[PDB]
Amino acid sequence: MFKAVLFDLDGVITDAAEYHFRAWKALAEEIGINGVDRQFNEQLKGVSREDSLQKILDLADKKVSAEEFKELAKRKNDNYVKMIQDVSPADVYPGILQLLKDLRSNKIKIALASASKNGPFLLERMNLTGYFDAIADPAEVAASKPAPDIFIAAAHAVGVAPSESIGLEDSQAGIQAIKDSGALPIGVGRPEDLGDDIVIVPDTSHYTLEFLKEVWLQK
Ligand SMILES: [Mg+2]
Incomplete structure (x- = not known):
């Protein structure tokens, strides 16, 4: 898994x-x-x-x-x-808090792979800090999405290879960055915007632990 x-x-x-x-x-x-x-x-x-x-x-x-x-x-x-x-x-967003709880209860590591210069503050405001094992610092990333650097960094910051990871993104550039890191992308949005070659859900309520496990097993 x-x-x-x-x-x-x-x-x-x-x-x-x-x-x-x-x-x-x-x-x-x-x-x-x-x-x-x-x-x-x-x-x-x-x-x-x-x-x-x-x-x-x-x-x-x-x-x-x-x-x-x-x-x-x-x-x-x-x-x-x-x-x-x-x-x-x-x-x-809908579904995310429960996903975070379920990942944590299954000892699956959780990392942020965001360009946001206010990521840590924003996770604190949303009361999500305690679910995150690491936040990749975008100031230490040499190349932004669609380069894989920030996803590789996020995986490494929790002690895993990107190949052991799933990445969640809503943007074409982010999906490319996840692919190129070696992690498995699951997009949120439309195939019109994100392509027909990855698993996509229409909104974040579909990101459940059970769905991610199904996707992982079927890759
Ligand atoms: Mg995004």
Whole structure:
């Protein structure tokens, strides 16, 4: 049987993207720039804070000094950090808490494989810290998803090979990273978005220990 499950945060455990989008939209509103909507925001995922700000400024050809740029990046982050103070156990996706309990009770290791720079805080706010054996630090990852590095790191941080692990992801890049690490992917979403060559469930209520064991046995 598999020995570990490697979780992404966003789109699996919780909607982590939303508060970043909110904070960017608020910043843009404050300075009179229109166009920070959800399709635009897809262009900010995985992008640095400063490169993200520059994209927003570019929507209006808005010119700013280095000092004003620094203030704006700071303000968005301040607002974001304020917003995430309100994260709670209610922000946990359906099925995930029970899955975590069942994995733990079966002595299956649990690791986070997320780019989130606020992963540990967010798991604390959701009261999930005690279920996690390790969190892979994204600051120590040389290459982001779809590179496998962060999944390999998450497996290693719990003392297993990725080949002993299942990875859970909602993104095409994350599924590729899981494949390339040697772990077994189980996607959440649509085959239209994630491909027809992996096991996919339509939402996180389908991620149960019994389903993961079935999948493992049938691979
Ligand atoms: Mg994800």
